[PDB]
Amino acid sequence: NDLPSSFTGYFKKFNTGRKIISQEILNLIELRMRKGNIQLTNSAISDALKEIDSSVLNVAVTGETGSGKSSFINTLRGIGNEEEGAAKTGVVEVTMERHPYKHPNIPNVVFWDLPGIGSTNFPPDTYLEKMKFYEYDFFIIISATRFKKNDIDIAKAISMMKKEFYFVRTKVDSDITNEADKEKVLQDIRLNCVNTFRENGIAEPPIFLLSNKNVCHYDFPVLMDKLISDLPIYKRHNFMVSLPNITDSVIEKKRQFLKQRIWLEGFAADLVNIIPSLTFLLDSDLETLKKSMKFYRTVFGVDETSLQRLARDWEIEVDQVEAMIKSPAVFKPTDEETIQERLSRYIQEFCLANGYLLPKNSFLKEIFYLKYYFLDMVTEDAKTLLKEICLKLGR
Numbered sequence: 404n405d406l407p408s409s410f411t412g413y414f415k416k417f418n419t420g421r422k423i424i425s426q427e428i429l430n431l432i433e434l435r436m437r438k439g440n441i442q443l444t445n446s447a448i449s450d451a452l453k454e455i456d457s458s459v460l461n462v463a464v465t466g467e468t469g470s471g472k473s474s475f476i477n478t479l480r481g482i483g484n485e486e487e488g489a490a491k492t493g494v495v496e497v498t499m500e501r502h503p504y505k506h507p508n509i510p511n512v513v514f515w516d517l518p519g520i521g522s523t524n525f526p527p528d529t530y531l532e533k534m535k536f537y538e539y540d541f542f543i544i545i546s547a548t549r550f551k552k553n554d555i556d557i558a559k560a561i562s563m564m565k566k567e568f569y570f571v572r573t574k575v576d577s578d579i580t581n582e583a584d585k586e587k588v589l590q591d592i593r594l595n596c597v598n599t600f601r602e603n604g605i606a607e608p609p610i611f612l613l614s615n616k617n618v619c620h621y622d623f624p625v626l627m628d629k630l631i632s633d634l635p636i637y638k639r640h641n642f643m644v645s646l647p648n649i650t651d652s653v654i655e656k657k658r659q660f661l662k663q664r665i666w667l668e669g670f671a672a673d674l675v676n677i678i679p680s681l682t683f684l685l686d687s688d689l690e691t692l693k694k695s696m697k698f699y700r701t702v703f704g705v706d707e708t709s710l711q712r713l714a715r716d717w718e719i720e721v722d723q724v725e726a727m728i729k730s731p732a733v734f735k736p737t738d739e740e741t742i743q744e745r746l747s748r749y750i751q752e753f754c755l756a757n758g759y760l761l762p763k764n765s766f767l768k769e770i771f772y773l774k775y776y777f778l779d780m781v782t783e784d785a786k787t788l789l790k791e792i793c794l795k796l797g798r
């Protein structure tokens with residue numbers, strides 16, 4: 404009801420698995436706001452943001468040759484096996500070495516292509532030392548069949564390291580085009596695998612069936628969703644904005660994480676008692692806003708580049724695509740209206756639709772209502788295009 408509750412209350416609308424900050428740290432903050440420690444209150448918030456931003460993710464991807472490591476690594480990086488920078492390493496092995504692949508627009512996220520353990524005379528242990536297992540947040544164990552012994556021995560060596568690991572069963576689509584002229588045809592895969600684990604002295608483990616081709620029609624949505632949950636809270640935000648924008652819910656989950664960061668930021672910069680109006684912009688604020696808009700656009704796959712490589716796929720004109728959404732106009736110069744008049748209208752619209760988000764007479768600075776507005780605009784666009792991207796399919 405008062406400010407301290409308003410601050411932590413904002414996070415109530417996000418279930419445990421989608422919080423960008425821990426409930427313990429949140430209470431420690433509300434606590435300081437109540438004890439009257441402006442030092443530690445702005446300090447706490449500030450460190451939580453620094454730790455959230457500076458988080459570096461390192462995903463190890465392992466498995467036999469042709470299991471699907473390259474395509475998985477590319478699918479998460481949101482790029483085609485052909486596109487520039489794609490992890491087009493079928494049977495590299497011109498070096499039985501570990502290969503790193505950064506995320507195109509979201510650095511801090513790095514996938515590692517690990518040479519199958521069966522391509523080296525290294526025992527389950529020696530292998531992970533050379534591969535530097537200690538450098539990874541989690542492991543993606545990929546298998547085409549129903550997993551081999553090697554896969555289990557790796558997991559065992561990994562769990563003995565307190566590290567996370569996930570069993571991903573790829574090529575399911577390539578196993579459906581052999582039973583058509585889905586149903587329990589999946590149970591099969593789900594069974595062979597479960598029988599392999601029950602064959603290597605381990606309880607039944609979670610398994611994620613999926614096709615790199617049909618990027619979002621199986622356990623893929625559940626996996627990505629699970630990776631985020633299992634990640635230490637502070638590591639969530641950076642890996643979440645990097646995931647592929649496959650479903651509305653994925654887009655939405657991204658907005659929810661980003662809404663939370665805008666909130667933490669607004670409070671860090673200090674609340675004000677003057678109603679937002681943007682009567683005077685300021686060049687430093689305009690530059691910040693321009694970067695925020697650019698970032699969000701990248702994250703939701705609606706930036707300039709992404710729109711270009713979307714027109715050639717529809718044989719339409721870039722400008723034609725841009726007209727389909729609203730995010731690209733915001734900073735598009737016009738003789739008819741100033742960027743100030745426009746931004747001013749944005750704030751007014753926003754606050755009339757959402758209120759000020761805080762108790763009476765307390766408001767975030769103008770720049771943050773704007774950042775929320777841009778966030779809504781950009782997520783809607785993503786859902787717009789994505790939607791149109793689904794009509795023109797192959798079925």
Ligand SMILES: Nc1nc2c(ncn2[C@@H]2O[C@H](COP(=O)(O)OP(=O)(O)NP(=O)(O)O)[C@@H](O)[C@H]2O)c(=O)[nH]1
Pocket residue numbers: 466467468469470471472473474475492493494495519573574575576577613614615616
């Ligand atoms: N249908 C289908 N094909 C797939 C899938 N994944 C990989 N493929 C195909 O299988 C081949 C081998 O997969 P690839 O990505 O090279 O796996 P890899 O694990 O990296 N091989 P290596 O272990 O030797 O490095 C490629 O022809 C690719 O087109 C999939 O999920 N569905």
